Amino acid sequence: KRSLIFASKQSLSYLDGTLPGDYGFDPLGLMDPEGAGGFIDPQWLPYAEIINGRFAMLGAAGAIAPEVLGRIGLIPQETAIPWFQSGVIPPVGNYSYWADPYTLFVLEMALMGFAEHRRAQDYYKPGSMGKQYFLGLEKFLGGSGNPAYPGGPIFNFLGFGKNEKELQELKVKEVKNGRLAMMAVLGYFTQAIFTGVGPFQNLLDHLADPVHNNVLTNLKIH
Amino acid sequence: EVKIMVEKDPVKTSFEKWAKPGHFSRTLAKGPNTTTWIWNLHADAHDFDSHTNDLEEISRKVFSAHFGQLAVIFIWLSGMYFHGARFSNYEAWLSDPTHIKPSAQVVWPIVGQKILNGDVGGGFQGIQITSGFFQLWRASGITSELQLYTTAIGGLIFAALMLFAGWFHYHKAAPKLAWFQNVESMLNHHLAGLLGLGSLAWAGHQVHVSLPINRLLDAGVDPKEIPLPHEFILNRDLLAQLYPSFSKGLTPFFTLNWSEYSDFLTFRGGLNPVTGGLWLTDTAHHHLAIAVLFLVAGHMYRTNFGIGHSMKEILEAHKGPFTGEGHKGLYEILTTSWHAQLAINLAMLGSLTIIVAHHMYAMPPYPYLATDYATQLSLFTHHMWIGGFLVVGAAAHAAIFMVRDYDPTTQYNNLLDRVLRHRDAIISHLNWVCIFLGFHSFGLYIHNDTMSALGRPQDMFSDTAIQLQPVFAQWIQNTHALAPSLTAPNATASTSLTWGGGDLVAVGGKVALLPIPLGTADFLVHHIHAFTIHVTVLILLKGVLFARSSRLIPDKANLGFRFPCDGPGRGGTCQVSAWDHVFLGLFWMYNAISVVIFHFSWKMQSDVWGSISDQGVVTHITGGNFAQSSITINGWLRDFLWAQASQVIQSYGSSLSAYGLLFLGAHFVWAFSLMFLFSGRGYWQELIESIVWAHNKLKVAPAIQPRALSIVQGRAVGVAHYLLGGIATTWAFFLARIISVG
Amino acid sequence: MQDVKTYLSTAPVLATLWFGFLAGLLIEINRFFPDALVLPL
Amino acid sequence: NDRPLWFPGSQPPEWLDGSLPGDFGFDPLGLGSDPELLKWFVQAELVHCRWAMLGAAGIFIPEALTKAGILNTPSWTVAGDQQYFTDATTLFVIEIILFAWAEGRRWADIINPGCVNVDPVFPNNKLTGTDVGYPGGLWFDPLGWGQTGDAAKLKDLRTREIKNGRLAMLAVLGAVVQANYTHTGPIDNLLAHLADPGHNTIFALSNLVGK
Amino acid sequence: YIGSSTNLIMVASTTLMLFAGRFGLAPSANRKSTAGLKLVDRDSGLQTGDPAGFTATDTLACGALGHVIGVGIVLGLKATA
Numbered sequence A: 001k002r003s004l005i006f007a008s009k010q011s012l013s014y015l016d017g018t019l020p021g022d023y024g025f026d027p028l029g030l031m032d033p034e035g036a037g038g039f040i041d042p043q044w045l046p047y048a049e050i051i052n053g054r055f056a057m058l059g060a061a062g063a064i065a066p067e068v069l070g071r072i073g074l075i076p077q078e079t080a081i082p083w084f085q086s087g088v089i090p091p092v093g094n095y096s097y098w099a100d101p102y103t104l105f106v107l108e109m110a111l112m113g114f115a116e117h118r119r120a121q122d123y124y125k126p127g128s129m130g131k132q133y134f135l136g137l138e139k140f141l142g143g144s145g146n147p148a149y150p151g152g153p154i155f156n157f158l159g160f161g162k163n164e165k166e167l168q169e170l171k172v173k174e175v176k177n178g179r180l181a182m183m184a185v186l187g188y189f190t191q192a193i194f195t196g197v198g199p200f201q202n203l204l205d206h207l208a209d210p211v212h213n214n215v216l217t218n219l220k221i222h
Numbered sequence B: 001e002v003k004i005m006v007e008k009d010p011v012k013t014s015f016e017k018w019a020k021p022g023h024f025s026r027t028l029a030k031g032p033n034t035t036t037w038i039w040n041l042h043a044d045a046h047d048f049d050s051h052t053n054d055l056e057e058i059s060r061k062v063f064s065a066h067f068g069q070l071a072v073i074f075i076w077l078s079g080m081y082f083h084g085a086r087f088s089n090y091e092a093w094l095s096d097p098t099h100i101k102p103s104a105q106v107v108w109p110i111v112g113q114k115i116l117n118g119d120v121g122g123g124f125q126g127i128q129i130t131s132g133f134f135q136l137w138r139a140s141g142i143t144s145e146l147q148l149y150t151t152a153i154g155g156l157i158f159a160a161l162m163l164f165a166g167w168f169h170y171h172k173a174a175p176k177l178a179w180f181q182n183v184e185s186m187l188n189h190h191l192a193g194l195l196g197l198g199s200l201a202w203a204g205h206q207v208h209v210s211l212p213i214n215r216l217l218d219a220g221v222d223p224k225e226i227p228l229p230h231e232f233i234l235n236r237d238l239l240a241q242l243y244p245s246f247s248k249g250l251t252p253f254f255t256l257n258w259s260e261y262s263d264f265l266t267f268r269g270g271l272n273p274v275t276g277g278l279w280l281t282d283t284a285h286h287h288l289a290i291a292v293l294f295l296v297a298g299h300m301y302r303t304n305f306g307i308g309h310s311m312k313e314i315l316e317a318h319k320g321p322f323t324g325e326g327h328k329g330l331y332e333i334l335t336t337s338w339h340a341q342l343a344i345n346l347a348m349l350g351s352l353t354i355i356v357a358h359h360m361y362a363m364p365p366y367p368y369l370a371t372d373y374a375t376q377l378s379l380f381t382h383h384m385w386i387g388g389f390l391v392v393g394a395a396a397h398a399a400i401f402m403v404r405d406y407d408p409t410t411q412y413n414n415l416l417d418r419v420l421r422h423r424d425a426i427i428s429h430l431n432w433v434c435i436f437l438g439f440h441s442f443g444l445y446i447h448n449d450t451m452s453a454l455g456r457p458q459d460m461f462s463d464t465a466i467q468l469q470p471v472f473a474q475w476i477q478n479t480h481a482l483a484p485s486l487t488a489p490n491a492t493a494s495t496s497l498t499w500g501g502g503d504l505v506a507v508g509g510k511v512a513l514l515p516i517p518l519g520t521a522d523f524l525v526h527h528i529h530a531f532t533i534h535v536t537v538l539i540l541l542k543g544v545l546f547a548r549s550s551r552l553i554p555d556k557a558n559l560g561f562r563f564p565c566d567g568p569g570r571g572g573t574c575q576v577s578a579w580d581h582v583f584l585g586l587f588w589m590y591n592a593i594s595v596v597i598f599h600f601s602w603k604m605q606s607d608v609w610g611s612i613s614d615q616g617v618v619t620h621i622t623g624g625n626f627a628q629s630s631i632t633i634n635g636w637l638r639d640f641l642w643a644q645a646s647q648v649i650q651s652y653g654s655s656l657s658a659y660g661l662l663f664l665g666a667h668f669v670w671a672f673s674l675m676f677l678f679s680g681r682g683y684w685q686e687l688i689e690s691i692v693w694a695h696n697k698l699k700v701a702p703a704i705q706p707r708a709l710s711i712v713q714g715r716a717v718g719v720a721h722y723l724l725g726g727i728a729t730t731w732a733f734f735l736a737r738i739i740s741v742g
Numbered sequence C: 001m002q003d004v005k006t007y008l009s010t011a012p013v014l015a016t017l018w019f020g021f022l023a024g025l026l027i028e029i030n031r032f033f034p035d036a037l038v039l040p041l
Numbered sequence D: 001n002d003r004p005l006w007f008p009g010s011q012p013p014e015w016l017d018g019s020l021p022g023d024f025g026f027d028p029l030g031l032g033s034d035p036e037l038l039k040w041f042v043q044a045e046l047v048h049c050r051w052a053m054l055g056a057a058g059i060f061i062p063e064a065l066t067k068a069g070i071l072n073t074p075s076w077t078v079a080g081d082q083q084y085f086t087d088a089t090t091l092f093v094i095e096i097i098l099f100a101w102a103e104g105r106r107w108a109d110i111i112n113p114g115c116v117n118v119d120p121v122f123p124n125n126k127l128t129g130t131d132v133g134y135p136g137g138l139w140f141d142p143l144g145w146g147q148t149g150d151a152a153k154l155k156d157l158r159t160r161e162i163k164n165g166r167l168a169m170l171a172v173l174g175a176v177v178q179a180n181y182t183h184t185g186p187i188d189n190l191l192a193h194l195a196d197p198g199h200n201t202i203f204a205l206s207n208l209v210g211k
Numbered sequence E: 001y002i003g004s005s006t007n008l009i010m011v012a013s014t015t016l017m018l019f020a021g022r023f024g025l026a027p028s029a030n031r032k033s034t035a036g037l038k039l040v041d042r043d044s045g046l047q048t049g050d051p052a053g054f055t056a057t058d059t060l061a062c063g064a065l066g067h068v069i070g071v072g073i074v075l076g077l078k079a080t081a
């Protein structure tokens, strides 16, 4: 009834198809309900997958966007730099923003804490973020039964998924693009170490001379 | 099927049981009727088997206790690194390692103890440390105290992490028994993932951090201008000018042209002449090879993907005519008894620590380690004592398993049953060999004593007398000295400078290592070692094999593992319990390790350690008198105990005065142990009755009735104080002597 | 807090606290009034 | 009782039922589990708050007025070093003697509520305070604002000194740490932060790996 | 490098090991070896698209062992000749 990648008899017992990206791929049995615990349990792993995938969608489309936009020539060239040279890893490269990266990190930690702690409290205690006063817009951040899909007036303001069939198909599309983006960010990291140039540079090098520009020829690092 | 299985919130995190001391046991949870209760509270705290019969709960307690121990060790290591960062002269020692004594402990000026802040060199005053941490950090490529600080902060973070992990895996997500019984998965992960990956990671560190920094250090570059490790990782041209093979850049690894990595992956052997330690290229290649070997070996057992080995089927398939079912039922023993696993692992860890002690002096793995005689002696003695204690503990827990965890129904005509069934023959022959060894070693010493006292030196057992040459050890040394010539052609030097070849490494004006000669004295001392080891094994194995029953008490298993006696009947049943056998094996291990460390100290101070002059004349710390003085017990009393103790007793008024103080205090503690060992319990109980009368006369008698220590507790206190006093006496004596003469 | 206070009131914890306080007092006294064999009065 | 909490999602502790001023259910270590000790901690917080308010008013206001040039206060940290009409140790001992009376009377009020409300010299003065920690009367509440009748409005009047007090406690702790770290006055630190907030921060003097 | 002796040796070793595992000439996930070195069939529980029963774990195991053997042969032939 569905595509199976590397399913097993054990995995197919609890993976039936309710989840969007459910294809029975669980060779390690990490979502077995018999031994559910703190973070290794059926309720958390799909949520963690969705969140890692969404941040990976932002990363794969963000770690290469400045380089592409500078290659086509509409952002300043000094901002058109590989992702690892944007101050995230100062040794390989650094950039001077309005604030030093540790002050930026503290601000990021404060803002992301205010967001992430609320997300956590809605995961553990659903609907708890729509009661206490929060600058008057606590009613927008109420969420729904499913922690991964709040779908409020803010988190869903174009109103997709009016019907359940399109909603589920859109969920599956989200999960697939997220898995692809996660693998893409892993590729970004490994290629950054092994090549020393940005992902778009690697793509163009491969597109130029595919047989002399690949992993086999380019594990000489430099 | 190998899967993750836990239970959510098994134990509520509450302080309610903190207020109840003896909560873990039904007997102690009532309250302290007598003072014995207090001692019992501390003697049954970690005996989790006695708390309950549930194996799942025992396994959970053991896991969380291991997490706590890991947190404690992390705190200890973080403390060492902190004290290296602040209260140490590590950088001054880096500038001049041959003339500055390592020091990482500074005392406060309170009661005149400030004299202990001796002049160690480098504009620093403190306690001279002998732990070898300076040399280890030199090998790791540490050049600044900031790196030690960050290591210490990471150690504190890891200690907090381990503490939280223990809390989480006891009170929040506690693994079930099926999880603990997955021994195949545990072995695969601890071989491939723990040892193999750890060795690979350390090889990576060595390749990228230790080798370049240490080769710049060997060249004479001041550590201040030595580039930082990340500059070697990033600017790979800077790393390639030290080892050109890095310019190839992982191409040889994947093209299998591995010989191109011969620049930094060598098989030299021997010692680096500049530092006196092992070549770090050899160490890197070593760690890479063992990482590969462990990662391969960790793919042996079948977890859930087929392809592998069932250890139960391996064991059940190994049996022969001289045995019964062979290794049948041992899988259940080792998957259902924690004490059996503890016995095996303790024995292996003790033997491994003894191997470490023997191998770290013959091949000093750290720079400026051999010439630091104090560090060498301390490391050898420390690890010898640790190994001996672990072996005795293995015997103790084997006995505990035999008493409590042994099930005759599931063990019929297997190896354990058959060993139990001819224990009489085993102990008979072991007793005979113990007597024979004791005679033909110590009686040889007594013969030497007598002929020396009778004025008949030609009738002794020496090199100038009847000679007992260790021809087999000499042949092994000869074979190992010629190994690079014919047997290991891809070797530059032999395994160690101790085998032979006439090569002498002399860092500074001292002697690192040289060919160690073996003669009649070495023959005698090795046979003394064999005698002591066989007698210790006799005591411990007789305790283990006769723990359940004997011809005297056929129901000793019902008596338990830790009981004083069965009464004055049958002539007297004093110390029939296996616990008492461990109690005596502790004394015999003490003697064995003491003689071993004395032999090491005298042999090194006499034949190896010393100073070499510009001309090339090598003088030794003692003067090479081991070959002619170690053959006589008077020689040991005079040339070793009396001659080499001149410094601990004359250390008063100097920075070594603490060693003399602790020398005498350890003597005191040993003598104090003697009365717990010699006395009984009725005498002290009656004395306590008289003292209680004195207190009752003044209405100050406590409601918690004072009681004398139990018989088993009396023995435990006696042996603990005895070992502490003896070992601390030797510790002070060695440390004072080797700091004075080095 | 009842159980925590009860635990802190146990013999070993109270012994540690009391003896540490006594040791600190003696050490500080010796800091300010050291090496005295005779009570001056 | 459906009150705002320090952590919106979580439930509040059972001993923190919201009947105390400044209650937000913040007790993650459970140090208020003993009600008899909880009352003592309530008093301790109240006096700590009221002392830290005076500390902040005597630290930041004089510093700001000195920077403005109106006063010449010596930066509140060397304030102890300057010369006065008496020695510092003698001043401390006078302070201990003079505070023993007041602190002991407050202690007696805490231990035995309702007592020590009457003037010993002139019994006809008395203190018209009912709750512990709020002595009231005329010396302590000369404007008669602590007696309102409405419990809710009185609690609203409270929970303000608790909040200003907690803020002032944090402010004084920050002033101490900032003087120890930056070796500079607090208002000067404020002006430095406002000069370039992106760089004049705690990491200005830390000098970490990358900048 | 494609025509090099090292490449040929490694390819041959990996292909031979994969062939042996796939065609029942070596132990696999569904092919257990007894004490007599006779291959019996077992239910590993891993479903695979291979009609014979070659799984992804079988492929990984055979490839790993083939690489091990090929590295051994390559280094041995280099050291000897």
Ligand code: CLA
Binding pocket: A180, A183, A184, A186, A187, A188, A190, A191, A194, A195, A202, A203, A205, A206, A213, A214, A215, A216, A218, A219
């Ligand atoms: C989103 C997935 C993705 C994509 C599209 C690419 C694409 C590319 N990679 Mg990257 N890579 C990835 C994941 C990915 N990689 C991951 C996960 C790793 C870590 C193992 C790497 C590690 C890596 C290195 C070290 C190198 C490349 C290189 C390359 C280039 C091809 C030449 C080559 O030797 O490939 C080698 C490819 C691999 C080692 C990964 C293969 C397996 C992954 C899962 C990709 C599977 C692709 C699959 C068809 C899905 C594509 C999605 C879509 C385009 C249809 C090309 C630009 C080379 C380069 O930059 O050339 C100049 C190079 O040196 N990649």
Ligand code: CLA
Binding pocket: B062, B063, B066, B067, B070, B179, B180, B182, B183, B185, B186, B189, B190, B192, B193, B194
């Ligand atoms: C690659 C996987 C792996 C690794 C590295 C380890 C490593 C370790 N295990 Mg083993 N273990 C594993 C898999 C693994 N285990 C599996 C699959 C099981 C179930 C069958 C067990 C069951 C098990 C038991 C029952 C016990 C251990 C213990 C230990 C520790 C022994 C102390 C020591 O010498 O460590 C030296 C190294 C260190 C001290 C480094 C610090 C630890 C780092 C962070 C590695 C931790 C790896 C961890 C397994 C990853 C999961 C945690 C993650 C969710 C954060 C050691 C850290 C013993 C112990 O001490 O428990 C605490 C113990 O009693 N393990």
Ligand code: CLA
Binding pocket: B042, B043, B044, B045, B046, B047, B048, B342, B346, B389, B390, B391, B392, B393, B394, B396, B397, B400, B561, B562, B579, B582, B720, B724
């Ligand atoms: C991996 C190591 C390991 C582990 C996990 C255990 C675990 C256990 N052992 Mg085994 N044991 C070990 C090593 C180990 N032991 C070694 C090396 C020896 C040889 C000495 C023994 C000998 C031994 C015996 C003989 C007995 C145990 C017992 C026990 C149980 C503890 C119950 C108890 O009273 O402890 C609570 C803890 C203590 C009593 C320790 C108190 C402190 C000791 C006695 C002195 C400390 C010396 C100190 C270093 C001196 C300097 C400091 C001082 C100045 C303050 C528990 C199952 C007992 C048991 O299971 O009974 C059924 C038991 O009878 N063990």
Ligand code: CLA
Binding pocket: B431, B432, B434, B435, B436, B437, B438, B439, B442, B443, B444, B446, B535, B538, B539, B584, B587, B588
């Ligand atoms: C110096 C003190 C000393 C001596 C000499 C001995 C001697 C002995 N012990 Mg004892 N022991 C001692 C201290 C000592 N122990 C202490 C302090 C403890 C407490 C831990 C123990 C605990 C202990 C246990 C628990 C065990 C022994 C065992 C042994 C025996 C070792 C093997 C043997 O019999 O052949 C060697 C014998 C000797 C070295 C004795 C001296 C013989 C000399 C060399 C020759 C003299 C004879 C000469 C011809 C003179 C003849 C006299 C004639 C004229 C009357 C032996 C009887 C073990 C045993 O039963 O034997 C297997 C055993 O299990 N002992």
